[PDB]
Amino acid sequence: LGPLQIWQTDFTLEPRMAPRSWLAVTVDTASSAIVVTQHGRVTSVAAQHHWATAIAVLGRPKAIKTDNGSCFTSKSTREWLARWGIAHTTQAMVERANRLLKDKIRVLAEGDGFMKRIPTSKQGELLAKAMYALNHF
Amino acid sequence: LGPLQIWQTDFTLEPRMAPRSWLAVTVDTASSAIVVTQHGRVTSVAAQHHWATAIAVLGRPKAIKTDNGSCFTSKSTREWLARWGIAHTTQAMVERANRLLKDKIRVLAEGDGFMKRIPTSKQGELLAKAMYALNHF
């Protein structure tokens, strides 16, 4: 009787994480858990790479909600979701996630003395720490 | 009263994933969940990158068990674990994980017609699918 297995996914631009400043963000509407990956471009393949990670983390969802951006509605992405057996529909929860994540990234970056872009070699750990801070005790 | 929050972590070499063929593997001894990342070299920083991901995924553990490899016992890694407040001790569960993971990678690769090394552009999704298959329904 628990919540349905439905995600919302979006991309959000975060220059503190450049050059891979396109953050793909999934929120599990059941648990509120967030998965975020970084990408150098917003493409169908980026979305697919991100969901492959999100499935590794969260399991296989029944459905994913996105907007009607071309990277979500392309033949390529429609086929990839069909290959996984995931229903796709074309979002307040992921909008809130985007804000919580960008705020957390800024606080953690500034805490480490990075007032502008985060040095490339430090980004992966700082993004993972933001994800940890949003999801876990 | 649930299981203690203790991980085991190891590196295992998987040439099907070359050039980033060093797989860092954590198993949560509580749940049996596995986190795996790929690395081009086995270094203290690789271990730290891997645990940063594993914390994002699983939460912050109370302790991590490893062997006495230099990448785990270096000043750098001892300090990184202290920064996180994670107790470190210097492993059957992660050995089993290593085997389950390499077997799963081979089956999935061969299923996609890759009988030797997996093409670089396909590795990230295939590793994530192996992780998914081990952890989730």
Residue numbers in the entry:
A (entry chain A), B (entry chain A): 55 to 144, 153 to 199
Question: Paper's wording?
Answer:
During the replicative cycle of retroviruses, the retrotranscribed viral DNA is integrated into the host chromosome by the viral integrase protein (IN). Retroviral IN consists of three domains: the zinc-binding N-terminal domain (NTD), the catalytic core domain (CCD) and the C-terminal domain (CTD). The central CCD contains an invariant D,D(35)E motif, which forms a catalytic triad with two sites that can coordinate various divalent cations (Mg(II), Mn(II), Zn(II), Cd(II), Ca(II)) although Mg(II) is the likely metal cofactor in vivo. Rous-associated virus type 1 (RAV-1) is a replication-competent alpharetrovirus, member of ASLV subgroup A; the INs of this retrovirus genus are a good model for HIV IN.
As a control, the A182T mutant of RAV-1 IN CCD (termed RAV-1 IN CCDA182T), corresponding to the RSV-A IN CCD sequence, was purified and the crystallization conditions for both RAV-1 IN CCD and RSV-A IN CCD were tested; that is, a MES buffer at pH 6.0 and a citrate buffer at pH 6.2, respectively. Large crystals were obtained with the second set of conditions. Further, the huge crystals of RAV-1 IN CCDA182T were isomorphous to those of RSV-A IN CCD obtained under the same conditions. They belonged to space group P43212 with one molecule in the asymmetric unit. Synchrotron data for these crystals were collected to 1.55 Å resolutions. The refined structure of RAV-1 IN CCDA182T contains 137 residues, 1 citrate molecule and 122 water molecules (right). The 145–152 loop is disordered and is not observed in the electron density map, as in RSV-A IN CCD. Thus, the tertiary structure of RAV-1 IN CCD is nearly identical to that of RSV-A IN CCD, equivalent to that of RAV-1 IN CCDA182T (r.m.s. deviation of 0.4 Å on 132 Cα pairs) and respects the ribonuclease H fold. The A182T substitution mostly affects the side-chain orientation of the neighboring Arg179 of the α4-α5 loop. This arginine is hydrogen bonded to the side-chain oxygen atom OG of Thr182 in RSV-A IN CCD, whereas a similar contact is impossible with the aliphatic Ala182 in RAV-1 IN CCD. Thus, the A182T substitution influences crystal assembly via Arg179 and, either large tetragonal crystals or tiny hexagonal microcrystals are observed for RAV-1 IN CCDA182T, whereas only hexagonal crystals are obtained for RAV-1 IN CCD.
